[PDB]
Enzyme design. Structure first.
Site, PDB file in Angstrom:
ATOM      1  N   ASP A  43      43.226  34.026  39.230  1.00 40.12           N
ATOM      2  CA  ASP A  43      42.484  35.037  39.628  1.00 40.12           C
ATOM      3  C   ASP A  43      42.083  35.870  38.804  1.00 40.12           C
ATOM      4  OD1 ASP A  43      41.517  36.635  42.067  1.00 40.12           O
ATOM      5  OD2 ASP A  43      43.139  37.973  41.564  1.00 40.12           O
ATOM      6  N   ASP A  45      40.382  39.625  39.317  1.00 39.95           N
ATOM      7  CA  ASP A  45      40.559  41.111  40.036  1.00 39.95           C
ATOM      8  C   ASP A  45      41.743  41.305  40.259  1.00 39.95           C
ATOM      9  OD1 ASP A  45      37.559  42.205  40.054  1.00 39.95           O
ATOM     10  OD2 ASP A  45      37.308  40.400  41.299  1.00 39.95           O
TER      11      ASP A  45
HETATM   12  N1  LIG Z   1      29.683  41.706  48.811  1.00 34.74           N
HETATM   13  C1  LIG Z   1      31.039  41.891  48.743  1.00 34.74           C
HETATM   14  C2  LIG Z   1      32.012  40.806  48.764  1.00 34.74           C
HETATM   15  C3  LIG Z   1      33.314  41.117  48.417  1.00 34.74           C
HETATM   16  N2  LIG Z   1      33.425  42.311  47.964  1.00 34.74           N
HETATM   17  C4  LIG Z   1      34.976  42.618  47.504  1.00 34.74           C
HETATM   18  O1  LIG Z   1      35.340  41.802  46.190  1.00 34.74           O
HETATM   19  C5  LIG Z   1      36.292  41.110  46.280  1.00 34.74           C
HETATM   20  C6  LIG Z   1      36.386  39.959  45.169  1.00 34.74           C
HETATM   21  O2  LIG Z   1      36.319  40.604  43.915  1.00 34.74           O
HETATM   22  C7  LIG Z   1      36.705  40.745  47.754  1.00 34.74           C
HETATM   23  O3  LIG Z   1      37.788  40.611  48.052  1.00 34.74           O
HETATM   24  C8  LIG Z   1      36.082  41.569  48.515  1.00 34.74           C
HETATM   25  O4  LIG Z   1      36.931  42.862  48.789  1.00 34.74           O
HETATM   26  C9  LIG Z   1      32.556  43.028  47.564  1.00 34.74           C
HETATM   27  O5  LIG Z   1      33.155  44.365  47.087  1.00 34.74           O
HETATM   28  N3  LIG Z   1      31.324  43.005  47.986  1.00 34.74           N
HETATM   29 CL   LIG Z   2      39.091  36.882  44.291  1.00 31.52          CL
HETATM   30 MG   LIG Z   3      43.066  39.535  42.701  1.00 26.43          MG
END
Ligand SMILES: Nc1ccn([C@@H]2O[C@H](CO)[C@@H](O)[C@H]2O)c(=O)n1
Ligand SMILES: [Cl-]
Ligand SMILES: [Mg+2]
EC number: 3.1.3.91
Length: 298
Positions: A43, A45
Site C-alpha cells: 500500500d 498512504d
Molecule cells: N476522491 C477521493 C477518493 C478517496 N480519497 C481518500 O483517499 C484514500 C486513498 O488514498 C481513500 O481511502 C479515501 O479516504 C480522497 O481523498 N478523495
Molecule cells: Cl489505498
Molecule cells: Mg494505507
C-alpha cells in the site's frame, strides 16, 4: 533452519505475531526459495509514507497532495472537502458491511473523477507539492527499495489513491526503480484537459482479486513469483495479493498506529506480523536480508 529468537527485529516489543511458528516457517520457505521467487505488494498512504513523523509534521495523502495545487479552480478544494466530509465517515464504518460500502465508495470516486474534469493541469505542480514529503517516507525505505532492485524483485505499489502523486513522491524520493510498478487511479487527459481518472476504478474495497488477478497486465511480470510479502496499514490491504492463484506462501505485514488496543485483535487475526508504532521498513528489510544471505551462499 532459521529460528525467530535469532532474528532481532522480530524479537522487539512492537512486533506482534499471532503464531510465531508459522511466521518462522514462512521465513524459511522464503529463504529456501530465493529472491527469484519473491514479490512485493505494498500500500502507499501511511505504509510507505509515515503514520507518525519523527517531527510533529503532518503528512497528506496522494489525493491530499493533488488537492493542494494552485492550478486548481477556486471551487475544487471546496467541492472535494464536501465529498470527503460526506464519504470518509462511511469508508471507516465498522458496523457497515463491505458489500454496502462499495456502492458509496463508487459514488465518492465517481464524483471525484467528475470533479477533476474540464481544466488543464501540469504534472510539475504535483511534483512541487510532492518534493516536500520525500523526507516523510518510513525510515530505510530508500534502502528497502535498493534491496528490492538489487535482488530483481518485482515490487507493486497498489493504491486506491491518486497515482500521479504516488509516482511523484516515489520518483522524487529516488525510489521508483525499474522493478517498481504502480497500480492506482491515474489522471486522464483529453485534448489538453483533465477528464477524470483512467479506468479501472480502484477504491479501498477492491484492492484485491477484482482488480489484480491472472488476467491483469502486471501478472505476466510475477506469475513465477509464488512467495509474496504484502504490506499495509489497513485491514483491506491484507488481501491485495488474493488474486495471485499459485502463491504458496504469503507474509502479511500490517502497520498498526491508530487505535492500537481497539484494533489489535483484528490486526493480529488479519496479519501474520503486526508492527505497532513502527515508522521504519526494518522488518521487511530483515526478511530480504536473510533471503539474500541464502542467495549469496548458493
Ligand atoms: N476522491 C477521493 C477518493 C478517496 N480519497 C481518500 O483517499 C484514500 C486513498 O488514498 C481513500 O481511502 C479515501 O479516504 C480522497 O481523498 N478523495
Ligand atoms: Cl489505498
Ligand atoms: Mg494505507
Amino acid at each position: 533452519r532459521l529460528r525467530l529468537q535469532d532474528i532481532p527485529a522480530l524479537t522487539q516489543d512492537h512486533c506482534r505475531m499471532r503464531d510465531p511458528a508459522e511466521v518462522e516457517r514462512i521465513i524459511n520457505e522464503f529463504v529456501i526459495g530465493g529472491p527469484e521467487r519473491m514479490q512485493i505488494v505494498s500500500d502507499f498512504d501511511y505504509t510507505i509514507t509515515k503514520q507518525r513523523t519523527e517531527d510533529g509534521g503532518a503528512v497528506p495523502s496522494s489525493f491530499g497532495i493533488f488537492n493542494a495545487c494552485q492550478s486548481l479552480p477556486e471551487n475544487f478544494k471546496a467541492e472535494t472537502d464536501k465529498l470527503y466530509h460526506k464519504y470518509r465517515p462511511i469508508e471507516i464504518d465498522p458496523h457497515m458491511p463491505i458489500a454496502e460500502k462499495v456502492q458509496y465508495m463508487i459514488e465518492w470516486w465517481t464524483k471525484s473523477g467528475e470533479l477533476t474534469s474540464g481544466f488543464p493541469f501540469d504534472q510539475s505542480e504535483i511534483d512541487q507539492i510532492a518534493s516536500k514529503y520525500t523526507h516523510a517516507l518510513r525510515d530505510r525505505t530508500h534502502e528497502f527499495f535498493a534491496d528490492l532492485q538489487r535482488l530483481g524483485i518485482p515490487t507493486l505499489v497498489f493504491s486506491a489513491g491518486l497515482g500521479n502523486s504516488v509516482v511523484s513522491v516515489l520518483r522524487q524520493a529516488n525510489v521508483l526503480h525499474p522493478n517498481v510498478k504502480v497500480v492506482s487511479n491515474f489522471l486522464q487527459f483529453r485534448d489538453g484537459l483533465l477528464d477524470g481518472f483512467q479506468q479501472p476504478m480502484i477504491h479501498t474495497f477492491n484492492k484485491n482479486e477484482t482488480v489484480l488477478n491472472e488476467t491483469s497486465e502486471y501478472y505476466d511480470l510475477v506469475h513465477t513469483r509464488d512467495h509474496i510479502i504484502v504490506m499495509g496499514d489497513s485491514i483491506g490491504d491484507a488481501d491485495m495479493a488474493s488474486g495471485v492463484p499459485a502463491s504458496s506462501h504469503i507474509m502479511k505485514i500490517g502497520f498498526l498506529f491508530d487505535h492500537v488496543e481497539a484494533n489489535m485483535k483484528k490486526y493480529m487475526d488479519t496479519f501474520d506480523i503486526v508492527l505497532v508504532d513502527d515508522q521504519t521498513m526494518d522488518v521487511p528489510r530483515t526478511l530480504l536480508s536473510l533471503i539474500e544471505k541464502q542467495h549469496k551462499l548458493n
